[PDB]
Amino acid sequence: MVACETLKTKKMEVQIKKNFPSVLQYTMTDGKVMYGQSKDVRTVEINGTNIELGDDDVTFKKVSDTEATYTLKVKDEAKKIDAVITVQITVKANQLHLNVTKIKNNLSEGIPEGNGVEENAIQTLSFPNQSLVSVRSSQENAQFTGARMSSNTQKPGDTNFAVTEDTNVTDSDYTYGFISGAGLSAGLWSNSEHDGTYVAAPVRGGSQNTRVYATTQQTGDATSLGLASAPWYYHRTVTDSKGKKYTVAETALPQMAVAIAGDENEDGAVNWQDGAIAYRDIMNNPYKSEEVPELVAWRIAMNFGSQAQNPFLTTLDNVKKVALNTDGLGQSVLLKGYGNEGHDSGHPDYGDIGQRLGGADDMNTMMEEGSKYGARFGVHVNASEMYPEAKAFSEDMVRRNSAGGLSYGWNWLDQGVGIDGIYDLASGSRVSRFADLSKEVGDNMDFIYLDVWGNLTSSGSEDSWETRKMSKMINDNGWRMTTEWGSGNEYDSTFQHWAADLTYGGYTSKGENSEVMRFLRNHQKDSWVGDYPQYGGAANAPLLGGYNMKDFEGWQGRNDYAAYIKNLYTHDVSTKFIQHFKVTRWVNNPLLTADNGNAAAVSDPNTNNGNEQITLKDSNGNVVVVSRGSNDTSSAAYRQRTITFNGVKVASGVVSAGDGSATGDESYLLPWMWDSFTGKLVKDSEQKLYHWNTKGGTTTWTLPDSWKNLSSVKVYQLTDQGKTNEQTVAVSGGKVTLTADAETPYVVYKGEAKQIQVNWSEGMHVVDAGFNGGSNTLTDNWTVSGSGKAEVEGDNNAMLRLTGKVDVSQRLTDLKAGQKYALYVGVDNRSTGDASVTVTSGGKVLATNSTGKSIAKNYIKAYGHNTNSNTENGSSYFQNMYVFFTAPENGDATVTLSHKSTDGAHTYFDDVRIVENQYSGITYEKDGTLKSLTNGFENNAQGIWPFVVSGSEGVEDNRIHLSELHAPFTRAGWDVKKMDDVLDGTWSVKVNGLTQKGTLVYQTIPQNVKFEAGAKYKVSFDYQSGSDDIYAIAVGQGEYSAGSVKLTNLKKALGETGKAEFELTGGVNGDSWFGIYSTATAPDLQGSTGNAQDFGGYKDFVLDNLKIERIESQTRTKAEAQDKVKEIRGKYDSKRAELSDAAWQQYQDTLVKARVLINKNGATAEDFTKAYDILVALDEYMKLKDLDRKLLEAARAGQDDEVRILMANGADVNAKDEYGATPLHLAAWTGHLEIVEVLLKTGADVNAVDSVGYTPLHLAAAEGHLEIVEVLLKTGADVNAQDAQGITPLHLAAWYGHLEIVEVLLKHGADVNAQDCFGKTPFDLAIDNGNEDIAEVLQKAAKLGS
């Protein structure tokens, strides 16, 4: 009978066809009608083939008055298609859902086990020109609005156009699509993982997901524009990098919907904004997006290269600090390096929680305890790059290129290899690794941060489909999705690092630039464009703000706590406040023009003088209206923004430019009316307002309706200690007057506010381990004793500062009796008197350790107290001091941090960490002196102990870490690998590519290994070095200064472990140490190309099984020692003139020290032996320092054979004079090619610089020795080496007039455009000295730069 049926709700009646799942029309309660597919279109697409259905191919069943079921017989024998598709059409309110509930393939039994290939798989499905909802040219105000992806601030992702007779579109794809006309508006939602047309995206991470297809057709006189879903993936067949094919099941069954809207925002018009309001009821919502508005304080807490810079319980104290300063506002901490050894270590072993940070135990304590303060935690994971050390590393996981070789990644600590994305998904390997992490964290962790997804490292695909499957794995474990790139994961991501950290990428690589996407989802994502004016467009004071992310916990060296907090109040409190409301109207957008495809864009001259305005509303009917001052970019008023909450002004002014260029004048009094948990409204006594005034001053405000009848308010200034300086401010006629300091946070309450209670250092075995508890932490938690002074000093990261004779002690809690512990503390000692750490059980000393004056600066970029943090006087010598003890059976255990000296100098202590440690390799003498120290690096609490990282790279994410065993991948011989990562056990100390640095890589320090003045020690270790003489052993005293060290070159030991052993005599000051020096010798890459040069291990150095043993020395008499003083004296007293002031003062120091030992009352043979061994060591040092002085003279004078014998006898090839000139500098400058070449073949630094920044090449080129210049360039000299003044060898060649030297320099890579610090090029320097000949040649060379 009738070929149509009627589905009905209280909001509309929909007429549907019985012969195909098609809507004829939607009729609202008010009579208004929207069309569907008015033509006989019965097309189904399977695998790219279109099949038109007959009357016999479709069966209909009206289930209810709100449901109908169809069965579509889709067949094409020729194209290998035979299927039964079950489509269900359901209605609810003003929504119509069309879902494919069942797919039956008659040409298949299904996907074979292990995701094998399904022959004749239904891979794709769509209904071409289904026209679920349509508008005609013949209808009043018939228009279309679409959105595509744009990460470019200058290019909007939107389209707004009128549907006219001329309109002709065919499957025009959009992320979102809305059609309006004849008083109604609707938008189509589909779950299609189709990738298509985008405006601007620098990556593929589901950035191109286009789910709506607009197509026009003729409906009589009119052109109808109809919306359909983009194709769906069912059983997609994919190929891995090794050519292996897989069939992977659906992420979800095909689903789509439409929501018909009238005048939803009740303005004049019916446009896409009405359709967008109704679309929110049918649209997909990212998992856990309902918590985004609460996440005020986003940051990164970083750990890298075995250093445990941020253990999990430390991160909880920083959560407690931020909570105090923000008065409990929600937080979101991304843990960058939560696993393995830290950041870019152990990928993709997601279930491996960093043992050195406190393992899964402390991570869960941090997470459980942190939730009480509104903090959410999440981990940084990588699904694209893998390291041989990761237990997931396999030949199947390895991404291979078309040639069958590795698809290498970045080499830093170890060499990264690309993961096979398709294998990792199809094998179900990734789900298994996420599950491992899920087993560790349970329901405690909040989010996952997926790094690099979209940059085509795992596949050349990484499409929306793959991203959807990825987001599902993560969501399935109860985790919110966050990713790297701004355009990435349109569907499921709630945060993009390159959208939230505005610093990164530049104006083309930011967040989602769309009025449509932000209107819909602003309150669900931190994936937008915020204020960063130097990008222009969307980044010039967006009205809705935008997350501006700063950090203070090591991420990229970032550690300014005050800057972090000031930024939260400047941009993020207002951004988050706005995310508590949903956009309802958005008119007069200055970015939308007729020239960028937005001719029909929403313009109201009766709203905000015709300038931009956004109206947002919430479920309780609260209205926020954010209005722009002027729409003219050249106006001062373009950056003026007023915010009203229920008609009352709450924020006003210009924000400080997000690029930190220019401060503003913005002042606000924002009503924060939500809890930091579910975001539920809080009770009246819990209701508060946040005050901020950028410029400082006095401002008058109207309080919200709720507060109008109060006679007074209570105002508190917020600090690192919480609510301070309580003020009682009167209320007159519902208005308050607040005096604010510039850029200072205040919180306003209706009455007296109870202070948030913070118990510092929970589970840390001590209370206030980080000294964050103010000046009163020394009264309440730590107990100070002594004549001296103990202060909590530090305006950023607080520290304990000791001056004079003082002891700071505290009782240790919750230690397991009989169990082995390691207690370490950061120490920077500027006093000459000892700084100590002691553990005691009822007066008895369990363990003790001490440092004299600190000798090594801190070079750990991700550590709070590195030498760029200015602990005192522009440096930081912070290094950890350890005590190893066994927890007492009685329970009584106490820690004391002492300074013994009466010396006015300061000692700095921070981060007392008591951790379970099974290390037991230190043996002491009868006196508390070192007898023996052994370490296989198997129980290192943290770092490369007893060693510390030196400054070969400066303040950096150092390429030194504890390397982990994973045979066969970490052993020599796998692929192009030639060195073993681990020598003995599971751990070693790896150095990656730190060659030709000419300086110290790492060294022991006296607070780690103390060498007694005059004592003999035998030092031995197992090692592997990629080349001959690239690394060397250094032996020195006190702070490192070049030339003061005794260097022993280490021979090549590649693939087969070598053994190094030597003797050491403790220096008189007890400041003796040994380490690993990077020479100036170039590595032998042995024919290796590209990545094989880095992976081969030709430039690496692995050390293991260290053994420091005090040894017996041949016994001397007072006479033998006294006789040696005469020998030394009548050898070097005659050189007073020939030596420096400091060189002679240390010679006297040592001699006096040795003479104290000999002449001491009651001295014994140990004293006479020590005095003799000190003098023997002094002799060997003086002798080699005179061999360096004599080599610098023979390079200057010209003696060939003399330079050779001095060198043969051990004179330093890189010795420096008073001006920092090496023998190679002095030979190149006085013109001796013979000396230069032999010096180069020996291992002289061809790029060594003097005080002024001259390389030997600069001195050679300035003097005109062209044969020397040619040798230097061939032996590896930088042709573009710059002076302190910016002078290059080309400038000096040009000014001094050496035509031939100029031509050879520019024959090699010399830049002719290169300018000094005074803008002069080599050409300008030639036209000043009269070398017009040189100037003409130089002019000609620059000309060719076209």
Binding site: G1220, H1225, W1229, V1252, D1283, Q1285
Partner: peptide, 15 residues
Amino acid sequence: PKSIRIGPGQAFYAX
């Protein structure tokens, strides 16, 4: 101005 002749520790701009 611009140094007479440069060498070890002798900057190009000394006056």
